[PDB]
Amino acid sequence: XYXXXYX
Amino acid sequence: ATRLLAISPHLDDAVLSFGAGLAQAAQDGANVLVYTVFAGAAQPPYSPAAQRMHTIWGLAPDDDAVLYRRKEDIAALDHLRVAHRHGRFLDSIYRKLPDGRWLTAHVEGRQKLAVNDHSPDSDHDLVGEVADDIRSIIDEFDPTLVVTCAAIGEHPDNEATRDAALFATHEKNVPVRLWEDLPYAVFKSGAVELPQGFRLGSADVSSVKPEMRSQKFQAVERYSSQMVLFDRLDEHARQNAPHGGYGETTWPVVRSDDS
Ligand SMILES: *[C@@H]1O[C@H](CO)[C@@H](O)[C@H](O)[C@H]1NC(=O)CCCCCCC(C)C
Ligand SMILES: *[C@@H]1O[C@H](CO)[C@@H](O)[C@H](O)[C@H]1NC(C)=O
Ligand SMILES: *[C@@H]1O[C@H](CO)[C@@H](O)[C@H](O)[C@@H]1O
């Protein structure tokens, strides 16, 4: 995992 | 005299997470140095993911994005009247895996980035490198206190920064604290897994004068590239210590029993 955004 | 060493993973994280603590320390006459670990100047070509990030940040995709960031960091920290030190490690988007793959891959549709699967050996090797650099800075600057990130949000660069800082400060006998990573803490649990043998103490929710919040948010706006907000941060802070002002949550880190 990690993963960007912005949410 | 108090010498505060703040260890930021990326160019903005110390100001975003701990800008009011930096501003308060400065105000109190402390000697303050923000060392940013992943401020290494990346050499092109860039990966598809980096090139996409650069364009998201308003840059030509092949532009010197780290140079642009480093200048924003100098602007933001001079606003706070605190020193900078720009370390040599490459941001996740510039790193390669030992098998040649990019560490991070671009993913279509809002997600941006995801990290490539890889062996932990290279993550452990990165920590030892970062820890060597922190030990040298501790020898040179002689901090009375180190503050770095909790790595809430599990960014691999923040986890490496945090772990390296814990090992280095334990070996050097320098107290260390972790700040709550913003904005991640607004939307993530807050629970993290520290390296074996370390544990958090009791949280401190600071209370900062509204003047210190204003100086922090002004310094945040020097990071133009990273913006396209402040309301969210405000509500998180007031939500942390109500009947209270703005503040930032930090924890001391100590050794676990039996370790
Ligand atoms: C996202 O990961 C990138 C690749 O490692 C880093 O360059 C970048 O620093 C990372 N950003 C964050 O962790 C938080 C982004 C939200 C920042 C906007 C805050 C203000 C305007 C500076
Ligand atoms: C995504 O992050 C950008 C980065 O500055 C931020 O300004 C914006 O508020 C975010 N978008 C959202 C939360 O929908
Ligand atoms: C933020 O990230 C996770 C993983 O993509 C989602 O489950 C969540 O709803 C939001 O998209």
From TrEMBL, chain B:
InterPro entries: GlcNAc_PI_deacetylase-related, LmbE-like_dom_sf. Zn(2+) 4 binds at H118, D123. Keywords: Acyltransferase, Glycosyltransferase, Ligase, Metal-binding, Transferase, Zinc. One of its GO terms (biological process) is glycoside metabolic process. Zn(2+) 3 binds at H84. The keyword Acyltransferase applies. Zn(2+) 5 binds at E180, H236. Residues 238-259 are annotated as: Disordered. Zn(2+) 1 binds at H10, D13, N158. Signal peptide: none annotated. Zn(2+) 2 binds at H10, D91, D157. One of its GO terms (molecular function) is hydrolase activity, acting on carbon-nitrogen (but not peptide) bonds, in linear amides. The keyword Cell inner membrane does not apply. This is LmbE family N-acetylglucosaminyl deacetylase. It comes from Actinoplanes teichomyceticus.
